[model samples]
Target chain A: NYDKLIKDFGSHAIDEALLERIERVLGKKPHHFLRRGIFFSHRDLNLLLDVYESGQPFYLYTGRGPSSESMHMGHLIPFMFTKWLQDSFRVPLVIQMTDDEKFYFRNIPMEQVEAMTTENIKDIIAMGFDPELTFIFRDFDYMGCMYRTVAKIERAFTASQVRGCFGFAMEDNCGRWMFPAIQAAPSFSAAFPHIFPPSMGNVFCLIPQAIDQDPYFRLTRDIAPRLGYLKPAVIHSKFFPGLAVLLTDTEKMVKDKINVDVPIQWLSFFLEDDEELARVKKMTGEVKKLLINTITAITKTHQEKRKLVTDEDVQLFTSTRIMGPAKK
Target chain B: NYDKLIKDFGSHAIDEALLERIERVLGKKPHHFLRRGIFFSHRDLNLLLDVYESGQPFYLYTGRGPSSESMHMGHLIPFMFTKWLQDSFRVPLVIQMTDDEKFYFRNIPMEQVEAMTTENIKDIIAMGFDPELTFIFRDFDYMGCMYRTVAKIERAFTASQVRGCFGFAMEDNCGRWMFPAIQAAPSFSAAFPHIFPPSMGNVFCLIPQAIDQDPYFRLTRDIAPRLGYLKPAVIHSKFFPGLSAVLLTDTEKMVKDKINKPIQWLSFFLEDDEELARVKKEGRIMTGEVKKLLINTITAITKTHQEKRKLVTDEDVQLFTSTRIMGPAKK
Candidate 1:
């Protein structure tokens, strides 16, 4: 279903020449997101080109909302990117599956919500993500491990931050209301076991989604400096449009349409742009303001509230209280 | 802490005379509730006397509220009664802990609630409930077993019935609003593996809770006759007074002076007629309606709902759920 849609839409695939350039610049192997089709498209692949020359190592990150017994293929797009980034860069990848998110969206029982999370883990494993390099965990399961990370994210973030970023409403479940902090944890390599070791200065490269996920990444970028980690270099992709695949017709259409300034209707279909179409594509660059605002707010708020909780505060709350021994 | 309280308050061990009466009537050994401090007090030891004379058998029934981790000393109080009944009668005992009830209360996380339930099982085991003769389960864990009972109870009940009986508000969690059916399920013997086999037409005796729990039994009593199971006999205990051990002196003083009534003075100490007099030796009964009402309220509500759920499964009912499983106790 996904591949067909990608092929039908006039999106460009990362050609072999581009892959070669990425390898030459990064000095190490290209991440799996690049090798595999997970990180399918990019805006300004040149930014990574410059970073590779600087001799700085960048980590990889991605996440999932463990909502159902079996995740639809659409769910793997981010994971695919994180997996590729880890393999290509030979860096650790942190995958956060938000079990809490599932409870918020569906009317299923709490036990059912938790059960679906295990099922999701098996599916992610079956997708061939390396267990050694990959850290797959649900929020409730990982509550103790990344406690500080979550607390920081929640403190730095606000209700308005979520509403602006995820379109949450007052009536949404508390779980939904608190998701942005959960989403922000994995972006920082320090949040994972492999990356946040005794040695601290690891920069990360997040070859994630584009405009739709910008708010979250924007939040991550702002908080990175405060946490003593580098802001991840992100390579965003446009949404894959259209419904089905047709390679021959798509290429031909791109070739003919490249020279003409056409509207965004048939743009949902076709995969390639003829040279003339690239010229016309420049003339038609439109931004979805609603999407940009959401993304910007996420980035700004995450950065703004960078230091929310300390270890002492966490210990105080999590520790059990003694009730004076139920006096006789 | 509990052991100290037990020693200080001096638990009233089950009277031996009653145990002998139970043995003659039920034709079996009573479960431990009869032997220990759990089923501490009783009334109408004569009913079993009459049943014993007639050579009839009765079974045991008791339950828990799967509310918190580490079944508090308070949670096990009724099981003590049912255990004794089972041992003396040599009949089966079925215990149900409503995990669904904890889920409805809403302050505790679901995962924590589940962990607490698992912990509760260990405590129940430690209490020495017989695995062979006893069937104990959490509501969510043993969903299949409880479902049949729940369906039977729910079918005969309406939400309006529960709301009216339980004093539930419109804004309460739906699970809380709907759980009387779950609580009402085990009133029939068929719900238990040990007791239901071969359908021994045993009379079940439930010594549960008084307090707000009455409304559920009132509903259960209305439906019992339609199910064909014997209406459970009930013996309710009043809410145990608080701070009695630590503040008994102050309580007695307040009861004598401020409350100023015979009944009102009773609330300060433990629920004992002698204890009330022992404190009253210092002065006259307090004179106040508030004091009188408080004392009477506790005493009135104590055993009033004891056999309420039993009323729902009385002989007049169609049958208590499935005939194959629910028929008289096999024992």
Candidate 2:
């Protein structure tokens, strides 16, 4: 249900002009991946496309917070984009399930946090990751490697640096203070086991995420080149607003004059008619006008509110639009 | 070679009276591990014995700064004691290698600091730790765990508390301001595994270290129970001072005479025919008397200057009991 909602509301209505600009700017036409619509929506699609056309390598890194037993649909957007990039470019991907982070932020106990990490990782695996090109890890069980990255990040940044980036308060737990380093650590190539070797050139990284998480990437980009890393390119998307009614011009003209107040006034006058009058009353301008005005008002309010509509709402409105106007 | 020196110096000298006194204070013989020369040496040995008799469980904690590739003799003392304690009492041991501290203080790069951590762990493991029962971690590798423990300590202790105990200065790096927390973290079982279970009970930590390190423990003890840990019982030892002749005597009288001036001297005088003739012609003071005077005066000086040895010098001598008793008398 949630997947369909995301597909219907968030994915289907992406801007085509922006996608074309991105394809052109990236130099090469969209990879089969993009052409097939696997690598989805973009904000400044053109600029990203331009960088890709230059033939320079860029990495993909995405992570799950591992806070829930099962991930909801909104969580799949980044992975969907990342999986496409990895397959298209044949580049490596690093997926971090921050179990340590969950323990720090959530109400769950440490043991439960570890358990949920293992549980959530299965879903990520089911999302079809190539084990050869991907590295997925839980923070608690892999402490040795986890700490190695954390140590580098800690030395590179200070408490003030973390506070500036993560908005951590002095009263906040140490877990919160250290969590930024955990997230930021994976951007480097060496942080992944199979991605790139330490001897290789600075690993180029690209992060695809929702815009709310921009602050973290902004901080990471600022620090990466200084730490002998290539700054990661980020692809951020605007919030997908919910669904609304779609109308045809013919339906609009017929419904424009059927005032609901006039219909209700006519209906009160028709109450005295019996058998033959019943069919007349039901078929008359009063009932038709009232039904048309109610549907129009409901559709207009929904558009005004920008509330997302269901398929049922769309079908009901469309069928009513076709038949109700002819009757009026 | 440095490891060899540590092995020799840290072999430990056992005090029999102290062992019996430990038993008495414990209200019974100590755990066989301790009674059989496991936990050894002490500052206020009496106090620790008293706590043991009172039915309290104290965990043992120690650390390495990883300042050098192979730890010097001074670095192994704590590990030696920690190893002994683990074997004797069957308690857990937490070993912290302050590789991050090394990075902050030493001019080495991060890669080098990490290398030193691995080398340090190998040597520590060689000291015979049960891998299952011991947790060896470097500060750089375990920042999350370290930060967790540090946050707990920081919440419990104030900056003033650390400054008073550690003589910390404001100009110190935030790393330095926070390092005491690093040491303080392992002083409790809650920061470590194989030491204490989560919320099962609190631990009583006994820290055996040089007196200069007291400041860190003082801060640790102040914040102990607040972090759900026991205060560490401190056993402080004197520093091993630098090279000098009078600085080496063990007896009070010899030390006193050395302070005045030693009456004896063991000089290597190479007397060839010409040199012997020159010595006879010059007719300096008799070698035998000079030696006696040098020995006694050196002894006395060593005794009197013991407390102020760091500053004491030849000019500050009150009595030059050597044969040529030279002093302000020349004035």
Candidate 3:
């Protein structure tokens, strides 16, 4: 499944040397995703490690599209690994809630997008990132900081480049044409000058995302050097198979069946469901073991930390991290 | 020359009825731009007048693409008429200095663009705008207020729609592709909630600009009703010809050749010293006659404005640029 994805997506394989380097830098064994082949592809992972080795800081960037109110198991794969990366490296993590992208691509109403962004942020907070080191922001809410950088990034790409990379047609709306820049802006640390210092404007960014999101980061990497910023390093994770297909079907089938609206008992496990837990208990043999292992890998910390977090804690955590340094 | 432009640009001619309506509303004679058919074209002038007749307020919006430090005679056509509209109707005015647009379109460095923006703002200030009722902003400085509105406007356009209107090519940069929205955003009065009261979100906008800028307003008008705002009314002006060939050339020729490099003998700029000497060396029109006409029209406001502008300090420019409202009451 991973090999096919590597070929299909044009992503580089995450070979043993990269995994060893990750373990060496963090002074611990790599996460299960890296130990196994779940995070099996990369782009410029060595460059990120090189920056880390030089005694300078780098940050983790990952995101969720939030097209629906609830995120499925597939949505948890990259974020779980990202949280692990943040904990291991002790670096800041900036998570983008691409509500505007969803609004443009999915034709979702603004009210629903806002609702979904809030719900999605709660799910991310439940993942138990260090409150002091994490930032989560919705697109339009943080656009005040993001717009100028977004414009600078926008200037680096032509319509032909976006169309070739993303399959945008002339008939596609201008928001979709311009939406890549919104996604690409976070790769530059300078985009958040208030949180990250202006001196770290060229700080390295490492993005851990699903292989499907590679095209966006690919475009980001292309423009980074031109803009005098380090190209964002990307670690691509293969799709987590849906529960219904963990023992029975091919990866493509699992990918197709994993969606937000899929019934809790049918195709996937959701992070927030207990009814689905009951269904998970009933699966026999190998399927049950695979489901339990996948859910445990993603949710162990979330379930443990759920009791420690409150609405107020999440609000306080986000407010301090979303803006820049305290002004005099 | 203007008749050829009215046909080539596919713009509507400003007829006698609209001119009379303007005179009737203001209780005064129309400015020379309208009377001499210099401000000769329009898109929805009647809709603006309709809002005016209903006693509802509509503000004026016009802008300059600050690609150069000095603005030539062609650049002042819209602004000059816009100032008259502001005085005639006593409405608020918003001028966008599109420094970012020039940066993207012309590949100018950011520092130079910033310098040009400050220089251009002084030139605009020298045009004698009522400082009490006017707000002027550069793109990047006011992006916090403009971006969400820009996104909403971007959603209303497709690449095909922009390409049809602006002649944008597939090879054009994404900044160029997205730029029409930045221009179109000011047409919606709601975009400036910090300045205008939110209660007047639906206040009409009248954009007085050159006919060449009609495509942007055309796209703006298309998305206006869809976004639940009033369609922006535009009164378009003919290009102010350079001194080189004021009468001999057609509209397209004049527009093509107008001040490509600011030849002192051809194009007269507001900042140029010895303006009468430069105008006296011109080719087509009696150099003295064209010079006198331009000097008389331009200096009527500028000479007084030069006196008033000296009282404006760098702190005043910073205050305006920083988005803070000025004046003692506001302070």
Candidate 4:
């Protein structure tokens, strides 16, 4: 199914050679996401590792559209892997909250868009990213810094290229035509002169995001060399399916092989569930135990860190991380 | 010929009714450019005059792409007319020097693009605009104030609309796709929050420009009502034929008759004395007479401007370009 999904998404599979090079360059074992094929695809990742091996620095860039008020467990997968990559490499991270994009593409009002950005930033800050290393910016608030870069990137893209890459139609708004440049500008280190030293124009960027975001980076990479910057490397993760879909699959698995009776509610667990709900869901045993264990193990550290993180801590994390070579 | 151009451009001919209304509204005769049919066409000139008559204020907006170091006389046609409109109506004027658009679209270097904006601004200021009533901005410097408005306008325009209007191709860069919004944003009074009060969203805009710029405003007008703003009214001027083309006809009659081969000779530029001399020699006109005619006309108009503009120090330009509205006018 992942093979079919990879083909459908126009992504390349992460093979053995690529994994070996990452491990060698990072000087540590790859995260469990890479080992277990959760991050199943890549583009130009070997090139990023080559830069890493050569003692040059690269930073991490990823983003969210903030389309919903609250993020589900599926949303945590890429951020979890991104946190590990940042810790292992001790590199700076830039997270974009595309509130403007959502405002343009959706029916959300300006007030609601601002509200959603604040809510999403709280959720992202709860992910336990290093306070000294992480930077997050909302589009509307950060536009003054981004305007020139977005303008430069927009000039490099054409309506035809966007249509081909994003399947944009003639009826799609001009905001859609121009938004790829906003997404792409972060890939170039020079776009953020306030965060990165304007002199360090050639620093490479590594983007860890879901495969659905590949098109934006493809356009970014296409324009990168022309803009006199290095192409950004991307590691693509598989979509984390919803609880309903997982339940259907588990039911079929039980019918076909295990023949073990399981409570329907046991198949799904939300990140927001209380201890009582999680305890009750855990009572189904074995299959539910595996799901609960995986959820708890993945989020245990984040939950504890989230409790300790203050609004001041988030402001410091989002504001203080300047861009340069990662700490060796 | 104007008839053909009007048809080709899908623009309406300026009728006598519109002329009468303009005169009545301003309590003055129209500028020579309008009276002589140099500015021959319109999309919504009558609507603009109607708003003026109703005592609802409207601002004038015009701009240049800043492709070259110097501006030719042809480039000044709209500005000359625009200056007359501002003087007649005593309304605020906004001029855009699209340095970013030129940088993206042209092969010029960024430094050169910025230099061209400064050069062009000096020439435009030399045109005798009221400094207190006028605001001129280069694209990159003013982008902070403009970005939100541009983003909102971009949301209303479709790629197909731009393709149809600008004939943009796939090979064209994404900047080309996004530039229409930049050009369109100033049409809304709300775009300049620091200059115009944001509550005055209903304020109308009148654009005086060369006909080639019609497509941008056409797209802007298409998006304006949807964005809950007044449609920008446009008055289009004919191209000023080059000296060589004018020389092909009897000089006296050429003013009335449309000249041919208008694109051949280099445009008569304001800054280049060598080109001016060359044109005089080629036209068989006495160099003294030609120089005197051009100098007297330019000197008569620019004498007061040059004096006033000299008093407008570099700090003034810096402040004007950096701020949303011109400084003295801020309330």
DockQ of each: 0.02, 0.10, 0.57, 0.50
Residues B1-331, candidate 4, lDDT per residue (tens digit)? 7688689768899888878878877788777666656677987777777777787677888887774544554566778778888888878788998988887787666778888778677767767688777888888867757677787787878888888878887788877777888888888887677667775556778888777767556667877776677888888877766555221112333322432212112222233445545664565765444544554444434454445545666766674465545422355
Question: What TM-score would each prediction reach against the true structure?
Answer: 0.37, 0.53, 0.79, 0.74
The stretch of ten residues in a row with the least summed lDDT in candidate 1 chain A is A319-328
DockQ of 1: 0.02
lDDT score of residue B83 within candidate 1: 58
Better of 2 and 4 by DockQ: 4
Model 1 alpha-carbon miss at residue B189, Å: 22
C-alpha lDDT of all candidate models, in order: 0.50, 0.53, 0.71, 0.69
Report chain A TM-scores, every model.
Answer: 0.59, 0.59, 0.78, 0.79
Quote the B-chain TM-score, candidate 4: 0.78
Sort the predicted structures by lDDT, highest score first.
3, 4, 2, 1
> Candidate 1 residues B99-202, lDDT tens each?
65776665455567667765554445545455556666666545444444454554456545565667755445435544666677777654564345534454
- Model 4 residue B227 CA deviation (Å) reads 1.2
lDDT of 4 by residue, A17-54 (tens): 88887787778877767766768897777777777778
Sort the predicted structures by DockQ, highest score first: 3, 4, 2, 1
**Can you write out model 1's per-residue Cα lDDT over A1-328, one digit (the tens) per residue?**
4444435442345677888887775576555445544355553355555665676555566666664544432344566556666666655555666776665566555568667766555555555555455555666545435544554555455445555667754444334544566677766655554345535345455656643555455665677676565666565554544322211123333334332222332331221234432443452334222222333343244334323433443333222222111111
C-alpha displacement of B257 in model 1, angstroms?
Answer: 23
